[PDB]
Structures are given as C-alpha cells and as structure tokens.
Design an enzyme around this catalytic site. Structure first.
Site, PDB file in Angstrom:
ATOM      1  N   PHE A   1     -27.313  -8.770  51.096  1.00 55.84           N
ATOM      2  CA  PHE A   1     -26.395  -7.750  50.615  1.00 55.84           C
ATOM      3  C   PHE A   1     -25.271  -7.433  51.588  1.00 55.84           C
ATOM      4  O   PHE A   1     -24.259  -6.866  51.167  1.00 55.84           O
ATOM      5  CB  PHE A   1     -27.153  -6.451  50.299  1.00 55.84           C
ATOM      6  CG  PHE A   1     -27.475  -5.627  51.514  1.00 55.84           C
ATOM      7  CD1 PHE A   1     -28.541  -5.961  52.330  1.00 55.84           C
ATOM      8  CD2 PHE A   1     -26.714  -4.514  51.833  1.00 55.84           C
ATOM      9  CE1 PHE A   1     -28.838  -5.205  53.447  1.00 55.84           C
ATOM     10  CE2 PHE A   1     -27.007  -3.754  52.949  1.00 55.84           C
ATOM     11  CZ  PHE A   1     -28.070  -4.100  53.757  1.00 55.84           C
ATOM     12  N   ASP A   2     -25.421  -7.771  52.866  1.00 57.70           N
ATOM     13  CA  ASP A   2     -24.397  -7.474  53.856  1.00 57.70           C
ATOM     14  C   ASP A   2     -24.521  -8.468  54.999  1.00 57.70           C
ATOM     15  O   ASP A   2     -25.575  -9.077  55.204  1.00 57.70           O
ATOM     16  CB  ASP A   2     -24.517  -6.034  54.368  1.00 57.70           C
ATOM     17  CG  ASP A   2     -23.296  -5.586  55.153  1.00 57.70           C
ATOM     18  OD1 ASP A   2     -22.376  -6.407  55.353  1.00 57.70           O
ATOM     19  OD2 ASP A   2     -23.258  -4.410  55.572  1.00 57.70           O
TER      20      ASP A   2
ATOM     21  N   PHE B   1     -32.847  -6.268  58.266  1.00 55.77           N
ATOM     22  CA  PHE B   1     -31.634  -6.527  59.033  1.00 55.77           C
ATOM     23  C   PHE B   1     -31.920  -7.563  60.111  1.00 55.77           C
ATOM     24  O   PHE B   1     -32.965  -7.507  60.764  1.00 55.77           O
ATOM     25  CB  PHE B   1     -31.103  -5.240  59.667  1.00 55.77           C
ATOM     26  CG  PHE B   1     -30.650  -4.215  58.669  1.00 55.77           C
ATOM     27  CD1 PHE B   1     -29.409  -4.319  58.064  1.00 55.77           C
ATOM     28  CD2 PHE B   1     -31.462  -3.143  58.341  1.00 55.77           C
ATOM     29  CE1 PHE B   1     -28.991  -3.376  57.144  1.00 55.77           C
ATOM     30  CE2 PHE B   1     -31.048  -2.195  57.425  1.00 55.77           C
ATOM     31  CZ  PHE B   1     -29.811  -2.312  56.826  1.00 55.77           C
TER      32      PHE B   1
ATOM     33  N   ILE C   1     -26.930   4.473  59.229  1.00 49.01           N
ATOM     34  CA  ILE C   1     -28.171   4.944  58.626  1.00 49.01           C
ATOM     35  C   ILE C   1     -29.242   5.123  59.700  1.00 49.01           C
ATOM     36  O   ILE C   1     -29.166   4.568  60.803  1.00 49.01           O
ATOM     37  CB  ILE C   1     -28.651   3.991  57.518  1.00 49.01           C
ATOM     38  CG1 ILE C   1     -28.881   2.587  58.080  1.00 49.01           C
ATOM     39  CG2 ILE C   1     -27.662   3.973  56.363  1.00 49.01           C
ATOM     40  CD1 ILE C   1     -29.658   1.679  57.155  1.00 49.01           C
TER      41      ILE C   1
ATOM     42  N   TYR D   1     -32.037   4.734  52.735  1.00 48.41           N
ATOM     43  CA  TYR D   1     -31.141   5.294  51.729  1.00 48.41           C
ATOM     44  C   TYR D   1     -31.787   6.288  50.776  1.00 48.41           C
ATOM     45  O   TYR D   1     -31.082   6.811  49.907  1.00 48.41           O
ATOM     46  CB  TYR D   1     -30.489   4.168  50.913  1.00 48.41           C
ATOM     47  CG  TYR D   1     -29.151   3.716  51.459  1.00 48.41           C
ATOM     48  CD1 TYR D   1     -27.982   4.382  51.116  1.00 48.41           C
ATOM     49  CD2 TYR D   1     -29.058   2.632  52.323  1.00 48.41           C
ATOM     50  CE1 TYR D   1     -26.757   3.978  51.610  1.00 48.41           C
ATOM     51  CE2 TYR D   1     -27.834   2.220  52.824  1.00 48.41           C
ATOM     52  CZ  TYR D   1     -26.688   2.897  52.463  1.00 48.41           C
ATOM     53  OH  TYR D   1     -25.467   2.498  52.954  1.00 48.41           O
TER      54      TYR D   1
ATOM     55  N   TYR E   1     -24.924  -8.428  62.626  1.00 47.54           N
ATOM     56  CA  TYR E   1     -26.090  -8.382  61.757  1.00 47.54           C
ATOM     57  C   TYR E   1     -25.795  -9.037  60.417  1.00 47.54           C
ATOM     58  O   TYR E   1     -24.643  -9.153  59.992  1.00 47.54           O
ATOM     59  CB  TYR E   1     -26.560  -6.939  61.534  1.00 47.54           C
ATOM     60  CG  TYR E   1     -25.628  -6.121  60.670  1.00 47.54           C
ATOM     61  CD1 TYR E   1     -24.484  -5.543  61.204  1.00 47.54           C
ATOM     62  CD2 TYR E   1     -25.894  -5.922  59.322  1.00 47.54           C
ATOM     63  CE1 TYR E   1     -23.628  -4.795  60.418  1.00 47.54           C
ATOM     64  CE2 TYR E   1     -25.044  -5.177  58.528  1.00 47.54           C
ATOM     65  CZ  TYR E   1     -23.914  -4.614  59.082  1.00 47.54           C
ATOM     66  OH  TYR E   1     -23.067  -3.869  58.293  1.00 47.54           O
TER      67      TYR E   1
END
Lengths: 430, 184, 107, 181, 324, 260
Positions: C36-37, C99, C56, C82, C26
């Site tokens: 961010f990731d 994502f 999550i 979150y 991902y």
C-alpha cells in the site's frame, strides 16, 4: 385481476399483442443511424424529440413504470407460468426486456424527461438486484445519469453501496464502471461527495477492482544433477553442497532482490518441474515442488515461515551456507555459517528427480561450492552426506542450465523446443 | 513440435540471414511476414500448466446447468470416452489468523483425514469426478450450523473426491501422492 | 502492541531518541501482502522528527526501538496504527500493518 | 469551411450561439468582395469575387444562418446580413436564383418567420431616452453612448437588413417578388 | 452460516443464494502463454575455477502484473492483449480512476497514487508492447493524478497579463526583431505574474496531514527527459511507417504521448534549451510534414495555439517594458 | 516565421484531405485566422493586461491564488466544503490590500462576473421553494456590494447584471438575518448615488418592482405564518425593502430624478 387473488381465468391477457406493440414502439423510438446525411439525421432527431415529448405529456413513462411494478412481483418464468399460463410464463422475461428497452429509448436523449422522473431513481436502484432485469435497469440508470445533472443530486450513499454490491455480486461488468464514471462527472462539473464515496467505498479492500503491482524478473540456476530414489539402484540417499556470494544489493531498483536457494523436485521422472509458469516473480520455494531458504524464512508453496537462528540475517555478501539432502527418513536441511538452522521440511514426497537450485532477481554474484573438480568446501559435511560432483553419473559431463528452458537473451536464433522424454532410464533377467 | 524436436523460427528482420528468400519470393512480390516492424514478435506458445477456466457453453462432453428450497448447479455429459475431471469453484474461502480447521462429514458423521492447518490461506472448493455415461454429481450450498457445501454424487461413487484446494495445477489420474511438506 | 523482526543488523549503538529526527526508508505492506505504500518508489527517504506525533503510533514506537543502519519488519495492530476506521480510501477498517523500514541517517 | 458553418447552422438548437469563428470569417468573406473599361473590369472582377464563394454554398449558408436565429437581433444576424450584402451586391441573378431554388426545395418557414421577427424589433427613436440623455449631458459630461446614443439601436443593422431584402428583389425578379408576398 | 455468506460483502444473511459469480471452473488445457521479449541476462563464468562455480546477474529487469483476487492469480500486463474481457475491464478501471479525481480533487488523487504505484506509470508510458487502450488509460491517469490540476490552474490565468515594474522586467524592451531575426516562441524572459507550482509528498504513515490541498508529488525531470526520448523515437518510427506502431495503431502511439508533452509544456517546464530542442524536433525547414491522423493533428493544433499564445504574451511584455 | 509556417500547414492539410470531426477544422481555421489577423490578439489582450509595481508582487500573487481557488470551486458542484472554501477565498479577497489600490484590476480579472455566476448556481434549482446556501448567497452579495461601492465604474459594471438579479431579488427578504447582503441590496448599491445610472435605469423593471410591491402588500408571508405570527393580511418587510430600493432609485445626491 389474476394477481390480486384467485379468480376464474376469463381474463384478457394479450401477451402476443403487447409483445408486438412493444417491438413496434422500440422501433418507433429508434435513434437514427450514423451513416446518414446530416440534414436527414437532424430531421430524424427532431422527430424523435417531438415523439418523446408527446409521450411524456401523456405520462406514459409512469404507465410503463407501473406495468413493470405489477410484473416484477414474480420471481421467474417458472413462477409466472403456473399462475398465468405457459405462454405468458415463457414470454415474461422477453416482455420485461422489451419494457425496459422501451423505457430506455423513451428517455435516451431528453434532458427534460430525465429531470422529470429523476424522483424514481430510488425505485430503480432498489430493484436493481432483480437478477433478470439488471442489464436493462443498468442501461436506464446510465442513460438517465448521463443527461440530467439533477438525477445525480439525489444519488445517496445507499445507492453507491447498492451499485458496488451489484458489481461485487455479478462480477467484472464494464458498464457498472461507466455508471460510476457518470456519477463522478456529469457535465464538465464534478461531485466531490460522489467522488469521495466511490473512492472510500470501492477500493480500500483491493478485492476489487483488478489489482496491480510492479515486480522483478527472477530466474533459477541448476546443474545437471538428477536424484531418483526407489527400490533397487540407490545413490546413498545423502547429498550436500555449499553456497557463497560475492556481491549483493538489498534493493537494486525498487524492491528487495530475490535470492533463495534449495532443492526442487520434478514431474514424475521427467525434467521441467511444476510450479510457476516461467518468467515470474517466483523462484524456489514458491511452489510445492521446490523448497528454498533466503536467510529469514523457509519457503514452500509460496508460503513463508520464519525460523529461529542465532543472529538473524539475510544472505549478505561473503555469506557461506550449506545444504544437506537426505531422502527417506529425514529431509532437506540448511545451515547458516556452519551451525544448522532450526527448521526443515519433513514428510515431503520423494517422487521426482531432485536437484540443487538457486533463484535470484538482479545484482548478484553466486558461487556453488562442490568438491574435487568443482571447488572446495568451506565447512565439513555431516557424516554420510556426499556432494553433487560425485552425484554426477560416471563418464558424463556436468554443466548448469537455468531451470527449464532457453531463458537466454538471444535473438530469433533460439532453439525453440517441444516435449521431451523421461531420460529413457527414469534388475537382472529372470 | 513433437517429442524431442528443436527448431528455429524466422519472421524476417534479417535479410542478411534470410537464406533462400532471394531464390524464391523476392521476384514474384512476396515479403517476409513482419518486414515493416521495429521490434520482435511476442512468439506466443501453448502453455503446459492447465489452469482452470469457466465452463464454455459451446463445449461438448461437458454441460453445467444452474437452477433455483435450496440452490444447486447440476451436471450432464454425452460422450463415449471417459476420463477424470477436476471441477473447481470460482472463488475461495479465506481463513484468517486464528481459524484453521476443516471437517468432512459424510452421510453419517465426521469421518475423514485431519485436514486442519491454515495460518492464512484461501481454500477453493473443488471436486474431482470420473466421467460416466450419466453423471449428475453436483454441488448444493446447504446449511446446518456453519458453511456447508454438499457435493451430492450418484451411482458409481468410488473414485470421485470432494475437498477444498489452493492453487494447484497438476493434471493426472491419481488418488494420493499429492504434493505436501511439513515445516518444523 | 507493535513487534519487530531484525533483518539486517544496525550495530545496536545509536538509537533514535527524543529531540532528534530520523531518516527512514520503508515499503509498507498490508496483512495480505498487497503493498500500500513505499518510500523507494518516490526515490526520497522519509524524514520525520521523533516525539511530536507526526506519524502513526505504530511507526513512531517501532522507530523508537531501532538503530542506525538496521533493517526491520514492523508488525502493528489496528488500534495502534489506524483504529476501527482506518485510512479513508486506502486502509480498510480493522487492518494490521506491516512495514519494511531501513534506517539511513540519524540527526 | 462553408460546409462546417452550414452544418453548425443546421444542427437543431434553441438559440444561435456566439460562434466567434463564424463572426470572424463572415467578416473576411464580406470584405473579400469589393472610363468605360475601368468600370466594366471592376464589375467583372466583382462578379468573379462573388462567384469565388457563392458556388461553394455561401448563398445557402446565409439563409440557414438567418433561419437558425428565429428572429433574434444580434451580432450573428448582423454579420450574416453583411455577408448577404457582399454576396448579393448588384443584380446577381445567379445568386438570387440559387437562394429562391433552395428556399423552394426546402420548404422552411423558419426563414421568413425569422425575417418577420427580426423586422418586428429593428429600431425606433425614443424621445424619452433622447431627452433623458440630454438631461444627463446637461448635468455632467457623460461619455457618449457607442450604440448611436442608445436612441437608435442598431440602425446600421436595420439598414443592412432592408438592403438585403431589397437586393433580393433587385432587378425585376417577379418570381421572388411573388414569393416574398 | 453459509459457504456463500463468507466470501462476499454480506454475512448476516442465512439464506443460501448463488450469485452469478459462483460458476464451476474445470481444469482445462486450452491456454496460451507469452514469451517476454527481454530476458534476465544470466552469464556463467564458464571457467569452472578452483574456488567454485560462478553465476552472475547485474542488469535489473522488472515487469508489472495484474492480480486477479477471486482467482488469486498473477498475470503479466502484456498478456491482456489476447484476453478481450480483461482488457476492456482494466481500460474502464483506468477510466474510473481518472474520473474519481478528474477535477481538483486531491484526497482521492493521494489515495490513487498508492492504489496503483508511483513508478509503474513511468514503466507503462515507457513500455512499447502495450495494448494501446491501457497505454492511453495510464497516460491519462498520469496526467490526472499529478499534472492536470496545475495545468488547468496555469491555463486559467493564460489570458490575463499582470506585469510588474521590476528592473528585470525593464530588460526585454528590445524583443529581438531587428538585424534579420525574429526569435523563437517561448524563448526569453517572462517576468509575468503566473501561479506557482508546489506538490505535497504522498505519505500514508504521517498521521494528521496538514491539508494536502495541492497535489501528490511527482519527479518532473525524469518525466520530461523520458517525454523527450519517447517523442524522438516516436517520430523516428513514424518516419519509416512501420506496421507495428506502439500500442497498436499510430493514434495510440502519438495521441497520449503528444498530450503528455502538451500538458508538460503548459505546466511551465522545458527551460530555454529544452524548448530549443523541442523546436528543432518539429520545425527544421519533421513532425508537421508527416501523414498524421485526425486526433494527432487536433493535439498539434493545441500545441501551435500555445506557441502563438506565448508570442502574444511576449509582445505584451515588451509593450509594457517600452511603455514604462 | 511561425505565422508563415502555421499558415503553410493549416491550408496544406485541408488541401490534402477532406476533414471530418468538425472540431479539428474549427481549430485549424481559428489558428489560421489568428495568424492572419495578428493584432486581434493584441486588441483583445491589452484591455485585460495590467501593471502594478515592483514591490507588491507577492501580495498580488496571493490575490491570484484566491481568484484561482474561487474559479476552481465554480467548476465544482455546490457543497458544504465548497461553500466554506468559497467563503474563505472571498474573505481573503476582502482583506487583500490590492483590492483597493487597483479597482481596474478587479474588472480586468472579471471577479464580478465570477461571483455573479457563482451565485446564480446557488439561486437556481428553485424559485420560491428553496433558498439553500444562504451564507453563500450572502457572501456573494456582500462581495458584489463592496466591489461596486469602492469605485466609479464597478457600479456601471454591475448595472448590466442589475436586470437579472431584480428577477430573483425576492430571496433573502422577510428575515432580519442579512440587513446587508441581498440581490435587491446589491441592485441598490449599484444604482446608488449616480444620476447617470439612475437615468440609464429605464423602466422595464421599475414596474416589475411595482408588481412585487403590490404582491407583498396583498399577500402575507408564508414564512412568517410558519414562524407563528398572527397573519396580518399584508406583508410589511419585503414591501419595506422594495420601498427602500425605489427610494434609492428615485432620490440621488439630494435632488429627485424627475423622470424616475
């Protein structure tokens, strides 16, 4: 006597005397230059330390602190002028700057001084938002934070918030970052509380600081087709061409491979369409002069809008797509594997010389599909829509440049070029 | 290079292709510009798209002053030639997912085009002003009920425009024909 | 509250089900497009076993509705991802998550 | 190297640091230095060895190191005094004149007051400690204390310091004899 | 309520103030663009075959760009060379990134890895047209985020020699010095108690991470191979003394690269073959004989210090082996 | 040949150029001295080397990890998570099995000095106005107490630091919360049951403790008056602690030390 209330102005305000004294004291507390002999430099350093300690003993740091206390109650030079006279009003800013410079110089080198009046940092940080003494307050704060670790022990969450807000309000100042570094580390020892506070209060939002990312190089490919519609000579205002791909890779190295196709306008009646600079991560559809499609979204002005279509997919290998262009009443239309997509870009400006274009990042084998001399059609065009091989002007060759310029992997032997003309052609005599 | 002019540049790195260096330069101690290099020169150019820049203080025919009740950022100019100028604010207003509307209210009430479409954009405040001998048209952040900027003009206000714009890099003296497209 | 775009089909025959691990790959992205990731930067697929709340809720439930060999875009909500506090340092409070998940293998 | 040590000793501080590099190199510098022809040749080569390092600033470096301690008995002064002994072995009139000229041209008290402080705390035998160690030995076989049974502390340091003060006046240097007073 | 009250930190303030960031910008033409030195390598079929018009692009190409948010504009990394303000600001930003995770702070390091990237660090350390200040900053950030913690921890147990009594320990008692040889520093068997390395995988979709107490994970084989490559062509470039060292002057070329090499050597990588290659990179009688600047020789002094420390450790281990 | 080559290059550089940045010249000369002396490294490192066995390797790895964590927390400013991690590491060192079989390894690794100037950082900042991190102070004190207890030489090692900790031994008194952990109590544990150490205990500090006892017997405890006690004109708690320390200094192994 003047600030407490309205009193007759028979008061002594030695503005020039105090300015000269401040300049003399700033020179008195001048650090020695680096272009000096070692022995003389050490002597000057010892003399400066003795002077600073002697001034500390008289508690004159508190005295200048109360002077700027009494002087900061105003707002601007105009505010001070009509209350204390024109000369005092116009010298108020200079006096503030000189006082702050003297305060910084009195404490530049001492650890003892910084430890002594660390209790006043709640004051300086609170008035840091003066906006006419911010530089001086920041310099004093930095020079007191660097020396004494005791000062860091009283730095709270509110002070961190105040400094970050000062950065966000005054812009990209490189001294705020130095202050934050000194807050994080003082003398080979770190403060996990301050580190965590800065980390979770400064860059969760990414509005600051200056962001960063790694993207792929993208370029375009367009043929020698120009389409200008206006009164008089017209070209049926109907065009159509297909596109197929041999090999493709969803992710070649780290990010999704760019692959878009569509029609791009031009600037007036000249080539070199507006949009991305060149050599970016932006191809067709990332500007207002190009309209592209990548299988899932419609791209226009670097804003993607997803569109419905039976069997949602990206442009995988062995995919045949069709592009229609009508100019006046309808607009640019796309079809995925025969049947048309459910979105299209109506009511766009028809000014310019339109052309087909395809943009790709890497790991791609693309095949334009024109008719006759350039290939076959995998699908039947809608009625009226012609193709580019007929769009080419009679008795001119047709090739494919990239989009704008010499984007060729070549050595210094590159034909670097200046401006061009509008083709000199983009009614009988009366 | 001017219109329709194409050339080639040679800073060195190929003494086998430096044609007339042996004729002149090699004898009286002249070296190529970048002879002791391991990589090609970056070859910077004059970019064509005119992106926005901060007003420089050392700039003639353009002066911007800041004062301050209410705050404003006033203008001035001393020039003999006139053009159209594209002043823009520093940073834009961000619109979230729900909110999407912009209303232009003149000296009377709301009376302008229906510019209310923004799923998630950043509109940068701007005004395009024609240069006069005395041009004091400026911006005042005011308050009535919500965000409100007043681009106060002066005499000869017929070809100046005031709106909010996204990233747009086009220098020309035009009224309409602005780039647009409606996705269905 | 999580929703899915299919991007490439995953032949809709094998699904992640309770008592199994899933191999995803991902590139997370914020609402404003700032990444961010990503699991492709570190060049290793993300392996996570389903049903023991180790990821999550948004990623958990989105992967629960996916198939082998599929590409999906998961759009989540702050409460399911979150909450009102976010991830300290990385994710701002009250932020939606996007994502780009591709499913490789399914043990 | 001498300039580095001199600058380190000249930098203003509150106490002389351990400076293991200085302690190691003063050792080497001191150990570098040291039937009529065989006695004249060795004297001449000793003079040459002393000249190999006293014209490069060691004479002033030793004085600066002593001045930078402010009268604190330690390994720093213990090593700089041995270096002074090595550099002043015999009647080195040139080295004595260099030291006197340096002291006169840089009118520093921090050398003579440091010498006074060093001599105020050199060493004294203490009967209490001596008989206490005797009692400890009688009670049990306790290993002998390395620093002279803790009854005479740094007797070698005291001997070296007074040998330095003597070599400074060796010969009949009346100028420096009067300077010391 | 206000224009200024919407695009800033505060919103509950109805007073219309104008902080200095709010400055009018006028559309100007005074601007320079930069040509990339590498192109996409687009090849057209040129045959105009009967099945269509073919264009091809296989070789990948990537670049990194800053995103000025308040201007909402993306600018290449290499364009920062001319812009002095942005250059200094980003250098100080990298310094702040290093500072907030300087010591053994791992939560902040885990945040910062995503706050920048994983692979742009490799791209920046490998790139040649770097402004120098950013090259050094990115090198220091790469050291601090991943390598600094374990490098410091292994340097902490450098002066302590705890040796077990295993049979493999009772095998280096020879310490080859006889038959006219001396061996090579760092080559052989250690069998000495040293702290282990283990790095936690940075994941932000995994709720309730256990402790993440060690470090973010980083691929070490790629990093060490790249360090070898860069050191090789760095010494190759410095041999001829060109006028464009990477990052500007030669200290910007050498100091960060040598620092990364030194901390990699400290960490306990470069197995015996790699150590041999690194030895012949300097020793043949290279890099010591070059005209190096003050910081470069300062770092190479630390390199020689470690080369002596490993010899001392080998001597101690051999002494213990014989003493057994 | 490495020593030869380094001695080549170090003097070569200084011959070629006059060198600024005194750090570089210091490093070069340290390297040259190391190359020439050679056996200095051996005589400095062998006192710090150790061997244990071929079976308990992972146990001492856990020990080394705990000590490394302790030193890392030493390198960071004093805090709540810092004190929690330090306490956990100290407890791990307690429960470690190697802590008993190899007491010489503890001295070689210098755990006593590490805990000494972990605790000095806490005890600093103030003298009679703040004794913050009492749990951290107590953990340090009990670690030093047990470390000097299980030995014959760790007592001698802590005897050197006994002089400093008597200066600030006033903390941790007038409170029945640690009857054990205290700087005064670790001084007692160091001097405990050894006539050699009792004799070597000279009297720079016995009359210091006498001054402290006199002050305790003259002044009441501000702490207790803030607690709400009837303010008797003298303090019987710190005085009792001082008397206990003096008793341990005087009486050893059943025979009173005459000089003390």
């Amino acid at each position: 006597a003047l600030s407490k209330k309205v009193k007759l102005p028979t008061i002594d305000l030695p503005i020039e005397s105090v300015s000269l004294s401040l300049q003399d004291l700033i020179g008195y507390f001048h650090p020695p230059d680096e272009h000096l002999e070692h022995e003389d430099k050490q002597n000057r350093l010892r003399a400066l330390k003795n002077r600073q300690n002697l001034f500390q003993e008289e508690g004159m740091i508190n005295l200048v602190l109360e002077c700027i206390d009494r002087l900061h109650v105003y707002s601007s030079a105009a505010h001070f002028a009509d209350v204390a006279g024109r000369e005092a009003g116009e010298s108020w800013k200079s006096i503030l700057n000189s006082l702050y410079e003297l305060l910084a110089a009195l404490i530049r080198g001492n650890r003892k001084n910084c430890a002594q009046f660390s209790g006043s940092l709640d004051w300086l940080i609170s008035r840091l938002e003066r906006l006419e003494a911010s530089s001086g307050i920041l310099e004093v704060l930095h020079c007191v934070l660097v020396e004494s670790p005791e000062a860091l022990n009283i730095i709270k969450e509110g002070h961190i918030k105040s400094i970050i807000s000062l950065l966000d309000k005054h812009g990209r100042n490189h001294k705020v970052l130095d202050v934050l570094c000194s807050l994080c580390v003082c003398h080979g020892v770190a403060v996990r509380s301050n580190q965590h506070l800065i980390c979770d209060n400064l860059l969760p939002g990414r509005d600051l600081l200056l962001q960063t990312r790694l993207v792929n190089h993208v370029s375009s490919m367009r043929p020698n087709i120009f389409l200008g519609v206006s009164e008089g000579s017209a070209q049926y205002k109907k065009w159509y061409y297909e596109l197929m791909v041999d090999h493709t890779e969803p992710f070649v190295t780290a990010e999704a491979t760019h692959l878009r196709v569509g029609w791009a306008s031009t600037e007036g009646y000249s080539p070199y369409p507006g949009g991305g600079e060149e050599w970016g991560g932006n191809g067709v559809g990332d500007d207002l002069f190009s309209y592209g499609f990548d299988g899932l979204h419609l791209w226009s002005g670097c804003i993607a809008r997803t569109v419905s279509s039976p069997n949602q997919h990206l442009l995988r290998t062995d995919d045949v797509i069709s592009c229609c262009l009508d100019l006046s009443a309808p607009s640019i239309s796309f079809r995925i594997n025969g049947q048309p997509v459910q979105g299209m870009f109506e009511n766009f400006n028809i000014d310019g010389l339109f052309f087909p274009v395809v943009s790709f990042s890497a790991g791609i084998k693309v095949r334009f599909l024109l008719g006759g001399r350039h290939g076959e059609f995998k699908f039947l065009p809608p009625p009226g829509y012609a193709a580019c091989y007929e769009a080419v002007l009679p008795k001119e060759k047709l090739k494919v440049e990239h989009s704008r310029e010499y984007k060729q992997e070549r050595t210094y032997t590159r034909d670097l070029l200046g401006p061009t003309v509008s083709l000199t052609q983009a009614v009988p005599v009366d | 290079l001017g219109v329709a002019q194409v050339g080639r540049m040679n800073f060195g790195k190929d003494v086998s292709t430096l044609k007339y260096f042996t004729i002149c330069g090699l004898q009286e101690g002249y070296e190529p510009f970048a002879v002791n290099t391991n990589r090609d020169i970056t070859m910077w150019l004059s970019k064509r798209l005119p992106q926005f820049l901060q007003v420089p203080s050392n700039h003639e025919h353009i002066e911007v002053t800041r004062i301050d009740k209410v705050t404003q950022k006033s203008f001035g100019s001393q020039n003999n030639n006139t053009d159209i100028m594209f002043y823009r604010l520093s940073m834009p207003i961000e619109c979230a997912x729900x909110x999407x509307x912009x209303x232009x209210x003149x000296x009377x009430x709301x009376x302008x085009x229906x510019x209310x479409x923004x799923x998630x954009x950043x509109x940068x405040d701007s005004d395009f002003e024609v240069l006069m001998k005395t041009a004091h048209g400026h911006l005042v952040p005011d308050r009535i009920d919500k965000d409100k900027e007043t681009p106060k003009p002066e005499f000869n206000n017929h070809k100046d425009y005031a709106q909010e714009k996204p990233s747009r890099l086009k220098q020309x003296x035009x009224x309409x024909x602005x780039x647009x497209x409606x996705x269905x | 509250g999580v929703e899915i775009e299919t991007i490439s089909p995953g032949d809709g025959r094998t699904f992640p089900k309770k008592g199994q691990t899933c191999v995803v790959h991902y590139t997370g992205m914020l609402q404003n497009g700032k990444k961010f990731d990503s699991s492709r930067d570190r060049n290793k697929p993300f392996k996570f076993r389903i049903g023991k709340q180790e990821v999550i809720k948004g990623f958990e439930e989105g992967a629960a509705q996916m198939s082998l060999g599929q590409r999906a875009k998961l759009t989540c909500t702050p409460d399911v991802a979150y909450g009102a506090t976010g991830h300290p340092g990385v994710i701002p409070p009250n932020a939606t998550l996007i994502f780009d998940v591709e499913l490789l293998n399914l043990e | 190297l001498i300039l580095l040590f001199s600058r380190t000793a000249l930098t203003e501080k509150c106490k002389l640091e351990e400076d293991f590099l200085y302690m190691a190199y003063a050792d080497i510098m001191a150990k570098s230095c040291h039937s009529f022809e065989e006695k004249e040749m060795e004297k001449q080569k000793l003079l040459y060895q002393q000249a190999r390092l006293h014209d490069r600033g060691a004479a002033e470096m030793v004085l600066q190191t002593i001045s930078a301690s402010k009268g604190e008995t330690g390994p720093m002064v213990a090593a700089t005094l041995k270096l002074g002994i090595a550099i002043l072995n015999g009647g080195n009139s040139t080295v004595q004149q260099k030291m006197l000229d340096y002291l006169k041209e840089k009118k520093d008290v921090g050398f003579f007051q440091s010498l006074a402080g060093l001599m105020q705390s050199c060493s004294v035998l203490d009967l209490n400690a001596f008989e206490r160690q005797n009692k400890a030995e009688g009670l049990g076989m306790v290993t002998e204390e390395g620093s002279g049974e803790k009854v005479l502390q740094d007797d070698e340091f005291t001997c070296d310091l007074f040998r330095f003060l003597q070599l400074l006046c060796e010969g009949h240097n009346s100028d420096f004899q009067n300077y010391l007073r | 309520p206000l224009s200024a009250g919407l695009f800033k930190s505060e919103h509950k303030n109805p007073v219309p103030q104008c902080p200095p960031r709010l400055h009018v910008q006028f559309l100007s033409h005074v601007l320079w663009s930069r040509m990339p030195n590498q192109f996409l390598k687009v090849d057209v079929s040129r045959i105009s075959e009967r099945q269509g018009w073919l264009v091809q692009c296989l070789d990948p190409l990537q670049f990194m760009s800053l995103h000025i948010p308040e201007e909402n504009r993306s600018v290449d990394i290499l364009e920062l060379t001319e812009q002095e303000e942005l250059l200094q600001f980003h250098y100080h930003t990298l310094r702040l990134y290093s500072a907030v995770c300087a010591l053994g702070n791992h939560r902040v390091a885990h945040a910062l890895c995503s706050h920048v990237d994983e692979p742009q660090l490799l791209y920046a350390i490998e790139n040649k047209y770097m402004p120098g200040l950013l090259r050094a900053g990115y090198y220091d950030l790469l050291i601090d985020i991943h390598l600094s913690s374990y490098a410091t921890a292994r340097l902490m147990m450098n002066n302590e020699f705890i040796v077990p009594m295993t049979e493999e320990t009772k095998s280096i008692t020879l310490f080859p010095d006889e038959n006219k040889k001396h061996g090579l520093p760092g080559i052989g068997l250690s069998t000495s108690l040293r702290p282990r390395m283990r790095f936690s995988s940075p994941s932000f979709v995994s709720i309730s991470n256990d402790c993440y107490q060690y470090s973010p994970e980083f691929p070490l084989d790629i990093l060490k191979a790249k360090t070898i490559q860069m050191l090789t062509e760095a010494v190759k470039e410095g041999s001829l003394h060109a006028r464009d060292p990477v990052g500007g002057t030669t200290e910007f070329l050498f100091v960060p690269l040598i620092k990364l090499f030194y901390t990699l050597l400290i960490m306990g990588i470069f197995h015996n073959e790699d150590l041999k290659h690194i030895l012949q990179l300097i020793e043949p009688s290279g890099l010591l004989q070059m005209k190096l600047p003050e910081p470069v020789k300062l770092q190479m002094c630390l390199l020689l210090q470690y080369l002596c420390d490993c010899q001392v450790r080998h001597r101690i281990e051999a002494i213990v082996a014989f003493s057994d | 040949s490495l020593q030869q080559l380094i001695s080549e290059t170090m003097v070569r550089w200084a011959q070629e150029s006059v060198i600024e940045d005194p750090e570089l010249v210091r490093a070069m000369f340290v390297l040259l001295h190391r190359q020439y002396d050679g056996i200095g490294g051996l005589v400095r490192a062998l006192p710090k080397t150790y061997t244990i066995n071929g079976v308990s390797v992972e146990d001492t790895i856990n020990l080394l990890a705990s000590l490394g964590q302790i030193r890392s927390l030493l390198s960071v400013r004093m805090g709540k998570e810092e004190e929690k991690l330090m306490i956990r590491g100290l407890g791990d060192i307690m429960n470690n099995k190697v802590f008993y079989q190899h007491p010489n390894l503890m001295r070689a690794l210098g755990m006593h000095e590490t805990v000494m100037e972990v605790m000095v950082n806490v005890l600093g900042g103030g003298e009679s106005k703040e004794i913050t991190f009492p749990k951290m102070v107590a953990n340090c004190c009990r670690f030093l107490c047990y470390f000097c207890r299980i030995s014959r030489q760790n007592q001698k090692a802590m005897f050197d630091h006994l002089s400093y900790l008597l200066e600030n031994s006033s903390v941790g008194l007038a409170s029945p919360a640690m009857r054990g952990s205290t700087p005064l109590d670790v001084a007692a544990a160091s001097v405990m049951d050894n006539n050699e150490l009792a004799l070597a205990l000279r009297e720079p500090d016995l009359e210091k403790v006498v001054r402290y006892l006199a002050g305790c017997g003259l002044q009441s405890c501000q702490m207790l008056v803030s607690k709400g006690y009837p303010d008797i004109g003298w303090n019987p708690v710190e005085g009792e602690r001082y008397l206990d320390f003096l008793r341990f200094a005087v009486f050893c192994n059943g025979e009173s030390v005459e000089e003390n």
